[PDB]
Ligand binder design. Structure first.
Ligand code: 0B9
Length: 260
């Protein structure tokens, strides 16, 4: 077993958490004690050899606000991805549960959680490439963490492309960069302050792409202060080089935290 490789005999499977296009995710214990999520990858869905090689680099990405990769099980099929367990599940579903009755201070803390993770990835020159609330998870303490960073590079399956999280230069020319992650982060802040509404909810993807290329934008969620709106809107400059960095976004968010 290599350092990126977990012995599947060390896993105890306890509950199913969800089933989707990338496979089935289960809750279990590692060596009888440690909570893990076990992702069993659907056969034929991923470029598995490429994914395994990249898993070695993913092992070295570690930040309190990134969902932790513990290792992979690749000797058998389906391959397993072993990750940090996040008891409260997907951020998008969490936002849509109105019983939480969130205060805006809690919403800003979720944005800061994500921005800290994203600042760390930026410092490692690592792109998420599909940042959205559906790819964030929530633990039992209510902390939001960023998941599936870089995963889309290995998905073999466009009618399912994240149009609504993409800047004009991605939609027009497939120009991915740090600044396309910045754009997506702004949409993610909009999702959080909108309690999980679909961005451009009344539009199709094709209509959204035309809207955005014409220079039109999402507008202020009811729960976002003017200062919070300024931060998310700064992510959507037509010119990619005029968008901030995640370091600057984090500073701006911390400043608003103090003021509010
Ligand atoms: O993980 C995913 N979906 C689960 C559904 C059940 C609820 N989840 C969790 N609940 C508790 N702890 C948890 N840790 C980790 C996840 C998790 C999220 C998705 N990614 C994905 C990637 C793959 F390569 C193979 C598969 Cl099958 C899925 C996507 C990020 C949302």
């Amino acid at each position: 077993y290599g350092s990126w490789e977990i012995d599947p005999k060390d896993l105890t499977f306890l509950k199913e958490l969800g089933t989707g296009q990338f496979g089935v995710v289960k809750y279990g214990k590692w060596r009888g004690q440690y909570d893990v999520a076990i992702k069993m990858i659907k056969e034929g869905s991923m470029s598995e050899d490429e994914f395994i090689e990249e898993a070695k680099v993913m092992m070295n990405l570690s930040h309190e606000k990134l969902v932790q990769l513990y290792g992979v099980c690749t000797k058998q099929r389906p391959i397993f991805i072993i990750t940090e367990y996040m008891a409260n599940g997907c951020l998008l579903n969490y936002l849509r549960e109105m019983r939480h009755r969130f205060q805006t201070q809690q919403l800003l803390e979720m944005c800061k959680d994500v921005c800290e993770a994203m600042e760390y990835l930026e410092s490692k020159q690592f792109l998420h490439r599909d940042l959205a609330a559906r790819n964030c998870l929530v633990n039992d303490q209510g902390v939001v963490k960023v998941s599936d960073f870089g995963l889309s590079r290995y998905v073999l399956d466009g009618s399912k492309f994240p149009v609504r999280w993409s800047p004009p230069e991605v939609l027009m020319y497939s120009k991915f960069s740090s600044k396309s992650d910045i754009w997506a982060f702004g949409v993610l802040m909009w999702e959080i302050y909108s309690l999980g509404k679909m961005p451009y909810e009344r539009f199709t993807n094709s209509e959204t792409a035309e809207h955005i290329a014409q220079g039109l934008r999402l507008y202020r969620p009811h729960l976002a202060s003017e200062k919070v709106y300024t931060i998310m809107y700064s992510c959507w400059h037509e010119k990619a080089d005029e968008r901030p960095t995640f370091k600057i976004l984090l500073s701006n968010i911390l400043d608003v935290m103090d003021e509010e």
